[PDB]
Amino acid sequence: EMPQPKTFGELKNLPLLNTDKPVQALMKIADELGEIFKFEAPGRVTRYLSSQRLIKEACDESRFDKNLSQALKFVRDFAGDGLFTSWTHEKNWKKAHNILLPSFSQQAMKGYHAMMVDIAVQLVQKWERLNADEHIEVPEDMTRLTLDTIGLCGFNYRFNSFYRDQPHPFITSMVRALDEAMNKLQRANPDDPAYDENKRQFQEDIKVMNDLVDKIIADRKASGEQSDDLLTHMLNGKDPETGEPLDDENIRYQIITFLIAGHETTSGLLSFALYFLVKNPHVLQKAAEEAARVLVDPVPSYKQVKQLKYVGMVLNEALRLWPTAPAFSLYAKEDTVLGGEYPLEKGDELMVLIPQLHRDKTIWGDDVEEFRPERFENPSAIPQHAFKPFGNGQRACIGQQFALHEATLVLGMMLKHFDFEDHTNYELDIKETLTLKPEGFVVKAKSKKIPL
Amino acid sequence: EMPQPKTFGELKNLPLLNTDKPVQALMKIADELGEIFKFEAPGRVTRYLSSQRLIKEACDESRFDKNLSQALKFVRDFAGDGLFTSWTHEKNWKKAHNILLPSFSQQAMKGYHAMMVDIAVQLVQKWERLNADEHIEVPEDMTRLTLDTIGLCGFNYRFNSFYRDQPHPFITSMVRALDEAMNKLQRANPDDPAYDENKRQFQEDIKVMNDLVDKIIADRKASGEQSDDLLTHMLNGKDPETGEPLDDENIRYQIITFLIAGHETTSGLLSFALYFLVKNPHVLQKAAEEAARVLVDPVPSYKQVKQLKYVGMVLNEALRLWPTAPAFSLYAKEDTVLGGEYPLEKGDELMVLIPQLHRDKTIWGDDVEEFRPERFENPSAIPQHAFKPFGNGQRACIGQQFALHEATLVLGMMLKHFDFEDHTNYELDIKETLTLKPEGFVVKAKSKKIPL
Amino acid sequence: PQPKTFGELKNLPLLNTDKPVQALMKIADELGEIFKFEAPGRVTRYLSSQRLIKEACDESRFDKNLSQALKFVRDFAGDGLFTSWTHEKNWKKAHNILLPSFSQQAMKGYHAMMVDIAVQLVQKWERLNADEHIEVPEDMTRLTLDTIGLCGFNYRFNSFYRDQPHPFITSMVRALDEAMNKLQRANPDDPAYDENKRQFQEDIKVMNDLVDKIIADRKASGEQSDDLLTHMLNGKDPETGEPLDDENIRYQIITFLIAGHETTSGLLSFALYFLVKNPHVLQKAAEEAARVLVDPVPSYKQVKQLKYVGMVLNEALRLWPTAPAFSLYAKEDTVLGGEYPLEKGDELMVLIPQLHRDKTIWGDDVEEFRPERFENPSAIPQHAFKPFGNGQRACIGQQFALHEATLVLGMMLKHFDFEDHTNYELDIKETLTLKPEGFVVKAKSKKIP
Amino acid sequence: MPQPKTFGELKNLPLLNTDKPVQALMKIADELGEIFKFEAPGRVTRYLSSQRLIKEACDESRFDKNLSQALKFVRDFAGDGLFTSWTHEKNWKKAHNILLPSFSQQAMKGYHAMMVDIAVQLVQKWERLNADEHIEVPEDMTRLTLDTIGLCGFNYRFNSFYRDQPHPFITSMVRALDEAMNKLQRANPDDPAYDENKRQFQEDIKVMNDLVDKIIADRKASGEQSDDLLTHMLNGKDPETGEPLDDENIRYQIITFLIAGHETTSGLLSFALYFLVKNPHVLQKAAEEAARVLVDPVPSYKQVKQLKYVGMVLNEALRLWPTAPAFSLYAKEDTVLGGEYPLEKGDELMVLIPQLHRDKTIWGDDVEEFRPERFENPSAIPQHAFKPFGNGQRACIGQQFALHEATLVLGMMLKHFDFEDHTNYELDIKETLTLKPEGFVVKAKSKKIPL
Ligand code: MNH
């Protein structure tokens, strides 16, 4: 027995998620019913933890294990058995994990950084070419940056998203697919032909995505191959344990997975970091100073971008306030007892609200809402289990260091070359396409005319 | 004692079966473990056999009988009392064997061949009517051909599967059900919330298959009948021993088993044979000559298939390297010692790795991986029980001559009417749905301008 | 004479239905021979009476006018023969180039590829289960689209190998549906229509892309096929002395693809409907196909010899045309009908379906269908039967559409009987062209070659 | 006086009805001869095809610039800009004396640094292509040329490479030019057959004018310490009048320069590259010269001026296919032209540049072969023989502006790429008042040289 929102007859607790912002509404519900409230759609039942005292127990890997949320299962139609959408028990998870983790080591990050240059630059000089009347769309440009970055770094493919003014075809099809997956949780009945058009769209969109994967495999095969991208490790790499590589199906699924998960979250992070820095003009200066004093060169090396640090505080704080991956699901291997008086049968599903967890007064204090980059000056103070926006344990985000290195590079370059002034009095708008992203975020940045 | 693979505690070997390719994992395991290796899962034990000298004893009709594999047991729900899934100490198996065996014969093959041509003509016309730029998905189009062949010949129903862009609903549902069979074997815990979703799906898919069979009986019921056919021999066919016709409820099961087992195996065989013919030019040239000399008339005759010698040799060699039916299971009918080294209590289950059996270097020479049809120039020279791709004894594929007849006829016409080009130097990737088929195998086939 | 006016939006709200042309039919039966359909920013007059229509088509003072629908179609059809004025340079030029391709001898040239596609359709209907029923409009679009692809551009769409509609058809119906939806929109600058534009552009690219595919397929092949494409690429108009530039030819490929599949599929669908509804009428068509064509595959001469089916097709066009209307404008200022002055540039809309239902010229039983009514074509006065347009602007692919209809229909009727088990109630789906919706029939073969 | 076939009451206007008026007139010039008379309803024009007869046409004493019918239709949006201005117009002398000096070869050095930036974008877009992709040469050259002229002269960045489709200005301008050319081939414009064009046409002007609004607002708002064509216009007091230009004429000049200064130049680059790829030895010589002369990552002005053979190839491409298809003049009083042809006052005189180079009397025979060796020494070419940039004071003011970037950009390309004519392109030419090869595509594999 647990508090739960009102039950609508045979439809149960499902129809409360009937809005464009389902994840954002679950926070408002959690503040009411408490740290956990049971949620019950037809058949499926979940529980949403909002306080660390219980989330820490859910995160013990011997007790509980990552579960695919009702949304991630719908994602499986194009993501397949990739790292994000594969069960930990499917041999593909551990196989691909051990195969692809070497690509995110410290030594491979140095090789990726020079490729990150191309696209961070490729954003900076785009903004240097803009005239005084034009405002710049931060989410739309951050998505371009991040997608180009993951393409060129991990798959040696240039999306050239800055050379198109409207989103890349892959981006439109992907947002359609994620929007559809979020809308499928909605549908009391997805079986009715009333959504048949959606199905026709899904395959269609997937086509585009799949087609792009073809372009990434077709070129490298015929390409002059002198690079060790993530793609070479997918095609030619072998698993230490299995002893055998990935099958074609899972290779394509991993390519799709990394495109989506490598650009969406990171672009949302850059957009939120800006929103809070542009909203608070008094946080910029130090950071700016930092870049200017930390970057002796206009184009930096991995030692220089590793030497900059305060950007880490600024950026980490955006995820603490608004993580671009809002939640993850877990399940119970055995009939353990959670948080004291909570007992769970085998396979009971558990969701955790990363934003609401991070929005806990006991650990972070009463002033949770405040955007404070101060908190992260020390890594040691916060308990490990309280704050984690990249997942938990072995199922934590595999490309965390990649994401953060890219984000600091881009954000610090922005603050180094430009002066940002909020000229739109933006009201907060958080679009949910399986992920959290500021919607309509528009700012303009007067250049600092700093040469290369 | 008996070697065995790595057991993770309670679940023992069972967690190994999760991979997309279980049979290939077992082949890898057999390469290291040896002739035979034990394989114990919670609640089930089976010993996998890879050396021919053990296979010859396991195959003896007076030594070991057929046992239902763990996956075949789950297959029963749609297939059931059909011979492939029926027991040997089963009533319906004996009745159906005695009365459906006469439906396969020289006279029978003659009955089916004229109608086979039609479907093969649909295939040839589709590939002839493709534009120059287009390419052919061999396994997909082979399943397309095989369904229509078996349907039109043995059930007087045209699936019209060639007129469909996507796979037939029967194909989708059948593949998905086989998915659950395999994936629930590999499953540790039988009950869990999540599986219910799966469970739902598998009620759905099955129904489609059921629904489809309802047409064959209904269609023939309404339309004209009394034209010697498998479906006739099921409706009006009578048991010589008991003077009894088949149970209608059991006739439908027969239809399921035949539809399923008549395409997947033959289509996988055709795809594999075309693949191996593509990797070696000379082995094609010889067969392209054979098809021309043996088949002069535009439509192949019932005699002209038997006149083709090299086509059958190519098919048998391709079936040797990758037998489309990967394994069969057998239980001991009385207490025996296998090989004189391993004692087995009666009823113990042994699985047989057919592809690993064909790779035994002692019998097939020390170049087993080499694909040369010439091995089957004198098929009499092959040792006894060394080559059993279709099965063993009474329990082995009543329509194996139909398998060979359709596959030889089709492949003869394919090599006659077309020129095959490989644009990707395809990386061999084997997708397993309890049956082996190449995945991603695409070639182009230029026209040779031959009539009808 | 004018229908009801709503605000400054004039009578535009009256066309805000699924089937605008049907509403117009009601309105001229209500308001008489002619009526002015005023709209915000565009004014035209709909004409339904043979007495005025026959006068309207004389090219002395009349020239073809692009209707609003054709103006919107110009975004993808462009400068092609269908969406260009007679004054426009590419109409005269490319029409002189492509007109030799529609000669009866050239028609013989098309006959063979047409027979390939027709036998493909007859096959799909010969592989029919007893359970299966055919969707006539959906399969007929396949027949006509593959026919034009193969015969005019030597490109096999393989539409019959697709139970789902071809990507070209999906994108094209979205674009044409948008052309129809842009008429009823009160204001086009609304931001809520921005999405509608994207898919529209999306819909266009598909079409364009497929067009480009054809040009690639032709470039690398044995160059031995005489069709529309070889003519457009290399042909030269004697007076102009020049071939078509690269940008025009793409518009011509799009133009012909659309105009060859949609209107023709409509004709054969409606003709099958009418044959189904009247058993005797249909008996004669099957019987004439049997007597006149003995060969397994029709000969060109045998297609031309068929005349009952020609009556059936012309009479189906009479009751229901597939091109619903054509628009003309006054070359110079003139007066029509004696009671109406018309300044230069005032445009008229000749409504083909009501024109065919003029009681004076065709008798009172205009609603009643009978191919026997076309037993003497010269007996019928001039411009009584104008479903193909006026003068030079009349359909350049008249004989191609008629040859396909006659040939294919003869094959269908000779090969088996047709049975409307569904007793389908005629619902005409309007997408710039008149096409029935949901018309499904079962035809059990006569087992002949 | 030789005339082509008068089809009917419409004089011989149906002769230009084909979309390629210049190509048809060029065939007609081969057949009819050195001069032929072409008359439309209400106007008569003379098309000259011979250098000896054009020689008298060149003299300013008897002939001065007259706006052609096409240019007169262009004037609607172009206004009294330098291109569509009369010589006997108060704004021509003003804007000429004020803007003639801005194209100085010494003023070119200030342009160079911004002129290489847009070329950096071109080379980058090509370098950053994936192997499966190809370059639309004219479509990308138009982006380069538009950004080049806009940035160098008006300090405005169109960012044409950042838009996958052509710029809004480009589409509206192409429709305006196509419209002005279309109005040429009309017996009577009054009828409402293409009165619809009149809304569309006017619509286009808005866009262009509206875009020009932005170019006035970005210069005033932000600080503008930039010397350029627009800065010269903004202040720009004429010495003769003693008075600056008014904003009636300022916007007209901005529009005039944008259109006339990217269209023709992108056409030139495309033509020259097509010729280079069709002729491998000429290419190889020019590409190796580009390697020798350009030793810096960012080229230097002196290096662009040093390239003689790149300019020679550009001049040969211009000679064969001049981007400006024709220029027209008017006569002073009565004079005898050629000795066989007399003319009254104000008689129209339109020079057909492409056919001028085709006549044997100068370049000898083999006029159609692309041989960039005809410009070895500039002096041996007869003076008055080669006039692709106009005549006299009505010669192109941008001759200095066009060639520099043309030598620069082209040079840069030859330095960083190897070009392959995979399509084996069959030549097709489009003339929206300016000649450019339509649909010409190549693949460009990089030389991996840094910038
Ligand atoms: C912003 C940055 C960012 C955030 C907030 C982020 C958040 C997450 C969260 C939360 C999870 C756990 C999901 C779950 O249901 O348990 C997760 C898993 C994952 N993430 Mn990421 N992630 C990236 C950047 C981020 N990830 C980037 C960049 C990549 C690609 C290079 C990436 C690739 C993954 C993959 C792959 C997984 C799945 C890992 C696994 O299951 O083994 N990521």
Ligand code: MNH
């Ligand atoms: C390639 C072609 C092909 C292969 C490799 C093939 C493989 C097999 C194998 C192996 C067995 C025995 C399984 C076991 O556990 O002992 C078997 C039995 C069977 N097969 Mn088939 N089989 C076909 C073609 C093949 N079969 C075709 C074609 C049909 C139908 C027309 C068919 C119908 C059967 C039936 C029915 C059985 C059951 C025989 C029995 O149990 O009495 N088939």
Ligand code: MNH
């Ligand atoms: C049913 C068959 C059928 C009908 C009713 C039909 C109706 C018309 C009508 C009506 C017009 C012109 C009326 C106007 O003034 O705008 C017209 C013009 C045209 N049609 Mn067709 N048309 C076809 C079949 C038909 N067309 C077929 C088939 C093709 C292609 C092969 C085709 C290609 C055209 C073209 C092209 C034009 C424009 C030619 C021109 O006006 O110069 N077609």
Ligand code: MNH
């Ligand atoms: C190669 C490229 C190129 C060619 C072949 C070219 C050709 C011409 C020709 C011919 C004329 C004369 C037209 C006539 O009717 O008299 C002319 C006039 C002109 N052109 Mn430019 N021109 C440019 C590049 C060219 N122009 C560029 C670049 C600019 C702008 C920077 C430019 C700006 C003009 C202007 C302005 C005029 C009008 C000068 C005048 O008559 O006052 N130009």
